[PDB]
Amino acid sequence: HWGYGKHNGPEHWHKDFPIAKGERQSPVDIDTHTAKYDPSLKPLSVSYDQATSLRILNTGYLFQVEFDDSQDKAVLKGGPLDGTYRLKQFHFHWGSLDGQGSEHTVDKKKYAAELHLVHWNTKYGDYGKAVQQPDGLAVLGIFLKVGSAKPGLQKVVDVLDSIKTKGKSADFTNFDPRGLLPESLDYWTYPGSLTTPPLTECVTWIVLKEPISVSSEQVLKFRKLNFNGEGEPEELMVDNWRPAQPLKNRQIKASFK
Numbered sequence: 383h384w385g386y387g388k389h390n391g392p393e394h395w396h397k398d399f400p401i402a403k404g405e406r407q408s409p410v411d412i413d414t415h416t417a418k419y420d421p422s423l424k425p426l427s428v429s430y431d432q433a434t435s436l437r438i439l440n441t442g443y444l445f446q447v448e449f450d451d452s453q454d455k456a457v458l459k460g461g462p463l464d465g466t467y468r469l470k471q472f473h474f475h476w477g478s479l480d481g482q483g484s485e486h487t488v489d490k491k492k493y494a495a496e497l498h499l500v501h502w503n504t505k506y507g508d509y510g511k512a513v514q515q516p517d518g519l520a521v522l523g524i525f526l527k528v529g530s531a532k533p534g535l536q537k538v539v540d541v542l543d544s545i546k547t548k549g550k551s552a553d554f555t556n557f558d559p560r561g562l563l564p565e566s567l568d569y570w571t572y573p574g575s576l577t578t579p580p581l582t583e584c585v586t587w588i589v590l591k592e593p594i595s596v597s598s599e600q601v602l603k604f605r606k607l608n609f610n611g612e613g614e615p616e617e618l619m620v621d622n623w624r625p626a627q628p629l630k631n632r633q634i635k636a637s638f639k
């Protein structure tokens with residue numbers, strides 16, 4: 383199956399998923415000197431006050447926290463978006479070393495990790511339909527740099543030992559994703575794709591300019607997760623990022639400066 387290694391990593395995905403070589407693939411390098419300030423973009427509206435987390439899961443590629451999206455409890459709107467996108471899950475990508483791990487880059491800079499908050503367009507009724515549409519998902523991406531701890535991340539870090547291996551889940555209720563956001567909602571946006579197979583070009587990306595700070599100890603705990611299942615040889619879950627893909631004809635817009 384696909385993964386992150388020499389024999390099944392990003393460079394191989396195109397054989398199963400030919401859209402890997404498509405015209406709107408993600409992630410990309412954000413060239414902050416060619417991005418265009420768009421005074422017509424709106425402010426983001428990030429409304430997570432009623433978010434209901436359910437569970438945390440090691441998928442064998444990353445870990446994710448899932449939400450109850452069967453009512454409008456937590457939604458993203460405004461900015462570049464038409465309509466209302468409902469929060470379904472968040473997850474992270476991270477590196478083996480503090481100098482890599484993000485999927486997007488900024489003027490070629492790599493961050494230690496990247497948080498993705500995945501939302502689906504409510505015009506399509508559910509996530510599975512949405513993922514099949516050109517404007518089905520909106521993913522809010524937030525960079526992580528190593529420095530001071532992020533207190534709102536610690537509940538996530540402390541449950542990771544209970545989901546060490548592929549396919550393990552744990553209850554994860556009452557988690558507030560507002561504690562993962564930076565102060566500023568300034569962002570870049572562009573049209574792209576899922577960053578893992580099936581690589582569908584269904585995503586409006588909204589990448590915040592301001593990183594969050596997490597401690598060295600917080601990210602080290604991410605790196606103690608395993609790609610393998612229990613009872614299989616241990617393979618540390620690190621470097622689960624796709625490198626930047628060609629921008630092609632796209633424009634990245636900035637909400638600021």
Ligand SMILES: NS(=O)(=O)c1c(F)c(F)c(S(=O)(=O)CCO)c(NCc2ccccc2)c1F
Pocket residue numbers: 441443444446470471498500509521575576577578579580581
């Ligand atoms: N990076 S990304 O935001 O484009 C992304 C992932 F990297 C990713 F691994 C996933 S995945 O874990 O589902 C793997 C298949 O693409 C999703 N989709 C996230 C998702 C998972 C469960 C429920 C709803 C959304 C996905 F959206």
Ligand SMILES: [Zn+2]
Pocket residue numbers: 473474475498577
């Ligand atoms: Zn992701």
